[PDB]
Amino acid sequence: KPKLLYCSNGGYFLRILPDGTVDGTKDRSDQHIQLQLAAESIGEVYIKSTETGQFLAMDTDGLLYGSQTPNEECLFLERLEENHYNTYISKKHAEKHWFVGLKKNGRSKLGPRTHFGQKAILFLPLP
Numbered sequence: 299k300p301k302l303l304y305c306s307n308g309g310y311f312l313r314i315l316p317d318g319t320v321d322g323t324k325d326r327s328d329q330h331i332q333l334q335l336a337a338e339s340i341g342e343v344y345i346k347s348t349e350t351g352q353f354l355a356m357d358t359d360g361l362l363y364g365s366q367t368p369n370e371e372c373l374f375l376e377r378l379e380e381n382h383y384n385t386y387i388s389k390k391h392a393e394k395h396w397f398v399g400l401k402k403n404g405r406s407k408l409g410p411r412t413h414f415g416q417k418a419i420l421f422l423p424l425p
């Protein structure tokens with residue numbers, strides 16, 4: 299079943315738009331925020347648009363984008379927190395510790411600027 303991913307940062311909702319831009323919006327009633335993430339392995343996720351069909355990917359520059367094709371850059375790893383919010387990692391760029399993050403202006407974040415402890419790094423699934 300669907301889920302909205304609520305970022306603690308500014309109270310936005312991860313949004314994959316059809317062109318492939320990933321940002322957050324605070325208009326919970328929007329078509330593109332509905333997200334469906336399936337576990338493809340032990341603590342390994344795939345978040346994907348319920349509407350457009352595309353995927354959450356992060357290129358080798360740290361920019362999260364929407365991909366048509368599930369490809370090596372679509373597996374983020376889930377990791378529950380102490381406060382019960384998640385934290386998704388790029389699996390291709392784990393080494394680096396590049397996460398999924400939104401800024402307080404909506405602009406998605408760059409993997410090479412996601413540090414453990416940011417309020418950006420935390421997302422919390424809602425129905």
Ligand SMILES: O=S(=O)(O)OC[C@H]1O[C@@](COS(=O)(=O)O)(O[C@H]2O[C@H](COS(=O)(=O)O)[C@@H](OS(=O)(=O)O)[C@H](OS(=O)(=O)O)[C@H]2OS(=O)(=O)O)[C@@H](OS(=O)(=O)O)[C@@H]1OS(=O)(=O)O
Binds near residue numbers: 407
């Ligand atoms: O463009 S911004 O809007 O982000 O304007 C701020 C630029 O400064 C950064 C520097 O990078 S950082 O060292 O990793 O922080 O971040 C600092 O300011 C932003 C601005 O907020 S805003 O909502 O984007 O307008 C804060 O970003 S955010 O994560 O809060 O959204 C940074 O906070 S934090 O690092 O994430 O905790 C803040 O730095 S700090 O809190 O003092 O450490 C760049 O934003 S950043 O990449 O998100 O950090 C901004 O330039 S950038 O092109 O947006 O990256």
